[PDB]
Design a protein around this nucleic acid. Sequence first.
RNA 1: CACGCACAGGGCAAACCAUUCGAAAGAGUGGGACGCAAAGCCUCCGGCCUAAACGGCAUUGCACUCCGCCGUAGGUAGCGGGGUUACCGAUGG
Length: 91
Amino acid sequence: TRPNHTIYINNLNEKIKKDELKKSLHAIFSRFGQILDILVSRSLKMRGQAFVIFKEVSSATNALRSMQGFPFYDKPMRIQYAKTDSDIIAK
RNA sequence: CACGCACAGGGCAAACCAUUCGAAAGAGUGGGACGCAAAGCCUCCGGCCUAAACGGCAUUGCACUCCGCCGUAGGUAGCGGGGUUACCGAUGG
Ligand SMILES: Nc1nc2c(ncn2[C@@H]2O[C@@H]3COP(=O)(O)O[C@H]4[C@@H](O)[C@H](n5cnc6c(=O)[nH]c(N)nc65)O[C@@H]4COP(=O)(O)O[C@H]3[C@H]2O)c(=O)[nH]1
């Protein structure tokens, strides 16, 4: 549970189109601070989950806690501290 | 109608290379020429190739490597059956 710049989210409505998620997560996580990116693959394993990269931890954290169990596309998303740091975060 | 190395006069073009289109398969154009008696034309049937989109299922996945099954949809007529039309006329029991 080491706080991170990026957040893991799952139980995502696998029915909503990639582009749509992208636009609609920014939609509610931008409220918590600038985002450098939101990554999402539609592949068998990476589906149902998105990765949101905030500018700084401070926002991820602020983010996380507030929207846990949050009904998104009639499907309540679990949230967590990304296990690793996205690539650009090195940079 | 069918048949075939009947030498008549022709057609086409595998791999490859260049380039355009497509998610892709693959397709078109250009050089190439493996090999075609229809390797002309047509996707109705079987096979195989691709999964972008569409519908169903499966999946709770910790990624920035790969991304599943069915339907379907496309492609292949140079994978095959089939249909259709065809040049030559050594050959038709
Ligand atoms: N006019 C005519 N003659 C026929 C036919 N069938 C056989 N022949 C004669 O037989 C020769 C060899 O035929 P092949 O074994 O089928 O071997 C053939 C064939 O496989 C190929 N070919 C030529 N033209 C065509 C064509 O229009 N379509 C296809 N699929 N293959 C062809 O080239 C080979 C040699 O061809 P050729 O030099 O012409 O020499 C030919 C030709 O003189 C026919 O339907 N029409």
